Amino acid sequence: WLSADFAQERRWKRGVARKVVRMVIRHHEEQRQKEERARREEQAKLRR
Amino acid sequence: LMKILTERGYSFTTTAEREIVRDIKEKLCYVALDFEQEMATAASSSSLEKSYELPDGQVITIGNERFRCPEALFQPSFLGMESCGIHETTFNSIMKCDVDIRKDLYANTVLSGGTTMYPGIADRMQKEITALAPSTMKIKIIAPPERKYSVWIGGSILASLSTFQQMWISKQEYDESGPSIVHRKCF
């Protein structure tokens, strides 16, 4: 039982780390979509 | 026009003469509907020539130069410019817009400014954009009689509207923000 549990835990935590990396990558490119959103709001101000 | 009148033998080079030639340009030049036919008529008949009285009392006769001058608007090659004519400039500008609005732009092509006060320019532009544009587009030039002042009249209209009074830069906003405020107000 405990060997399967160890394998599951290692697999799970490696996947968790990888998806935290992916999640933080998404957060950073959202922290650039922030600048794009400001630029797009300025274009919307031109249109207003 | 100074160039082609000098080639005609009426040499014009001084800063004062340039204004006499501008007066000739304003009074006697026109946009012909067909450049080749107009040239043929001018070469086969003198009915296209007009008399102009210079300030010293000398009378000079202006011929095909009346329409060869403004033709440079449509064929900049006469000036040595490798550029679009006004018809092509308008047509390509429309064709850089989204397809859905090109029909409205074709139907509302407006000529404005002092250089547009020639006779025949509206007809020539209409013909050119009908020949260039798709047959499906309902082309229409609009060329008002006061089009030399339309630039200013638009500002009169704009600035006198009650709802426009929110659009100004105020002295307070300039003091708060500096000149960059213009990028937040004026377009």
Decide: B95 and B82 in contact? Cβ < 8 Å: no
Distance CA B58, CA B60 (A): 7
Instruction: Give ∠ CA B86-B89-B92 in degrees, rounded to 5.
Output: 145
Q: Which two tokens stand for residue B65?
A: 């130069």
* Residue B110, amino acid: V
Length of chain A: 48
Which phi and psi (to 5°) does residue B81 adopt? -95, 125
Q: Which two tokens stand for residue A3?
A: 């060997």
Closest by CA to B5, choosing from B57, B49, B56, B55, is B49
| CA distances from residue A19 to A6, A33, B31, B40 in whole angstroms, order as listed | 20, 20, 70, 79
Closest by CA to B75, choosing from B128, B27, B114, is B128
Distance CA B66, CA B35 (A): 11
- List B52's β-bridge partners, or say none: B60
One of 3.40.50.300, 3.30.420.40, 3.90.199.10, 3.40.50.2300 is the CATH number of B85-150, namely 3.30.420.40
Experimental technique used?
cryo-EM
Which residues, 6+ apart, have CB-to-CB distance to B48 below 8 Å?
A: B38, B41, B42, B63, B64, B66, B67
Place of tokens 């501008």: B22
* Helix then strand then coil, % of chain B, to nearest 5: 55, 5, 35
Alpha-helix residue ranges (DSSP H) falling in A1-48: 2-47
**Distance spanning both ends of chain B, measured CA to CA:** 36
Decide: B107 and B62 in contact? Cβ < 8 Å: no
Which residues, 6+ apart, have CB-to-CB distance to B182 below 8 Å?
A: B169
Q: What is the CATH number of domain B1-83?
A: 3.90.640.10
Distance CA B71, CA B82 (A): 15
Q: Which two tokens stand for residue B12?
A: 């014009």
